[PDB]
C-alpha cells in the first residue's frame, strides 16, 4: 500500500473526500479485527485508523472509550496488535494509521510498527516536550506522524502544527458538535475552513458524525477526509456476536462509502 500523504493527495486532486474508518484493535478480539480490516478495505476505505487500547483514552468519545476497555479486557497489547498487522497489512490495498497514546510508545523505537506494515501514527496526547524527538524517530523509520489539532489550539500554534504534520492534518474535538434537533452545528463549517486557509495539506475531520446526510455536509464544507469512528465501533463491537458485528459493519461502511461518493 501507499503512504498516507500520497493516498490523500490523490483524492484531493480528484475532488474526492477520503473515507477513513476508525476501529479499536482487539474489540471484540484480534481475529475479528483482522477480518474487519479486510472488509473495510473491500468496502472502499481509503485509509484505516486503528486504535491501540490503553488504560486512559481520555481524548476519545464514550463509545470508543468503552471499546478500548473491552479490548483491554480481551488482554490485547501493543505487541499482539503489531503481530496481527504483520499478517494482515500485505492483504490490504489501503494504508493503516496506528493510533496510540504516548506512554505505551514512550519506551518504543518505532522499527517494529514499520516492520508490521503500519504507515502512519497518531499520538493524541503527545507531549509538547517530546513531539520533535518522536517526529524525528518516525521519519527515521519511514512512518508519517499525523498530528491533531482542535478548536482550542490558538491560530499561530495551529499553523506550526499544520507545517509539522505528515500524512494529513487531523481536526478533532472532545466536545460534541451536533445539537438536539439533530443538526450539525454551523460553527463546524468555520472550524474546518480556518485550518484549510493556512495549509495545502489534506485536512481530515474527526467530529463524531455518523449520518450519511451529515457526512456529506462535512465533505461539502471542504474536509479532504472524514473519520467515522464511534458509529463503526458501535456496529462492530456492540453487536450480538463477532459475525453479526462484521455483517453490520460492512452494511454501514457501504452506506458511508456511498454517501461520500
Swiss-Prot record:
<keyword id="KW-0057">Aromatic amino acid biosynthesis</keyword>
<dbReference type="GO" id="GO:0005829">
    <property type="term" value="C:cytosol"/>
</dbReference>
<dbReference type="GO" id="GO:0009507">
    <property type="term" value="C:chloroplast"/>
</dbReference>
<comment type="pathway">
    <text>Amino-acid biosynthesis; L-tryptophan biosynthesis; L-tryptophan from chorismate: step 5/5.</text>
</comment>
<keyword id="KW-0822">Tryptophan biosynthesis</keyword>
<protein>
    <recommendedName>
        <fullName>Indole-3-glycerol phosphate lyase, chloroplastic</fullName>
        <ecNumber>4.1.2.8</ecNumber>
        <ecNumber>4.2.1.20</ecNumber>
    </recommendedName>
</protein>
<dbReference type="GO" id="GO:0033984">
    <property type="term" value="F:indole-3-glycerol-phosphate lyase activity"/>
</dbReference>
<keyword id="KW-0150">Chloroplast</keyword>
<comment type="subunit">
    <text>Tetramer of two alpha and two beta chains for the tryptophan synthase activity. Homodimer of alpha chains for the indole-3-glycerol phosphate lyase activity.</text>
</comment>
<keyword id="KW-0809">Transit peptide</keyword>
<comment type="function">
    <text>The alpha subunit is responsible for the aldol cleavage of indoleglycerol phosphate to indole and glyceraldehyde 3-phosphate. In bacteria, tryptophan synthase alpha (TSA) activity is almost completely dependent on formation of an active alpha2beta2 complex with tryptophan synthase beta (TSB), and indole is usually not released during tryptophan synthesis. In maize, the TSA homolog BX1 catalyzes the formation of free indole from indole-3-glycerol phosphate, independently of TSB.</text>
</comment>
<dbReference type="GO" id="GO:0004834">
    <property type="term" value="F:tryptophan synthase activity"/>
</dbReference>
<comment type="similarity">
    <text>Belongs to the TrpA family.</text>
</comment>
<comment type="pathway">
    <text>Secondary metabolite biosynthesis; 2,4-dihydroxy-1,4-benzoxazin-3-one biosynthesis; 2,4-dihydroxy-1,4-benzoxazin-3-one from indoleglycerol phosphate: step 1/5.</text>
</comment>
<keyword id="KW-0934">Plastid</keyword>
<keyword id="KW-0456">Lyase</keyword>
<keyword id="KW-0028">Amino-acid biosynthesis</keyword>
<dbReference type="GO" id="GO:0000162">
    <property type="term" value="P:L-tryptophan biosynthetic process"/>
</dbReference>
Amino acid at each position: 500500500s501507499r503512504p498516507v500523504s500520497d493516498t490523500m493527495a490523490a483524492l484531493m486532486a480528484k475532488g474526492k473526500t477520503a473515507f477513513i474508518p476508525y476501529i479499536t484493535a482487539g474489540d471484540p478480539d484480534l481475529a475479528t479485527t483482522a477480518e474487519a480490516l479486510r472488509l473495510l478495505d473491500g468496502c472502499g476505505a481509503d485509509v484505516i485508523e486503528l486504535g491501540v487500547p490503553c488504560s486512559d483514552p481520555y481524548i476519545d468519545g464514550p463509545i470508543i472509550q468503552a471499546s478500548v476497555a473491552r479490548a483491554l479486557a480481551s488482554g490485547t497489547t501493543m505487541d499482539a496488535v503489531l503481530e496481527m498487522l504483520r499478517e494482515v497489512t500485505p492483504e490490504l490495498s489501503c494504508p493503516v494509521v496506528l493510533l496510540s497514546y504516548y506512554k505505551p510508545i514512550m519506551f518504543r523505537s518505532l522499527a517494529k510498527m514499520k516492520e508490521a506494515g503500519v504507515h502512519g501514527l497518531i499520538v493524541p496526547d503527545l507531549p509538547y516536550v517530546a513531539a520533535h524527538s518522536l517526529w524525528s524517530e518516525a521519519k527515521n523509520n519511514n512512518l508519517e506522524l499525523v498530528l491533531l489539532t482542535t478548536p482550542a489550539i490558538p491560530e499561530d500554534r495551529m499553523k506550526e502544527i499544520t507545517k509539522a504534520s505528515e500524512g494529513f492534518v487531523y481536526l478533532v474535538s472532545v466536545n460534541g458538535v451536533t445539537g438536539p434537533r439533530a443538526n450539525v452545528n454551523p460553527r463546524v463549517e468555520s472550524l474546518i475552513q480556518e485550518v484549510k486557509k493556512v495549509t495545502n495539506k489534506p485536512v481530515a475531520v474527526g467530529f463524531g458524525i455518523s449520518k450519511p446526510e451529515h457526512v456529506k455536509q462535512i465533505a461539502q464544507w471542504g474536509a479532504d477526509g472524514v473519520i467515522i469512528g464511534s458509529a463503526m465501533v458501535r456496529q462492530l463491537g456492540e453487536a450480538a456476536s463477532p459475525k453479526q458485528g462484521l455483517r453490520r459493519l460492512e452494511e454501514y461502511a457501504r452506506g458511508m462509502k456511498n454517501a461520500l461518493g
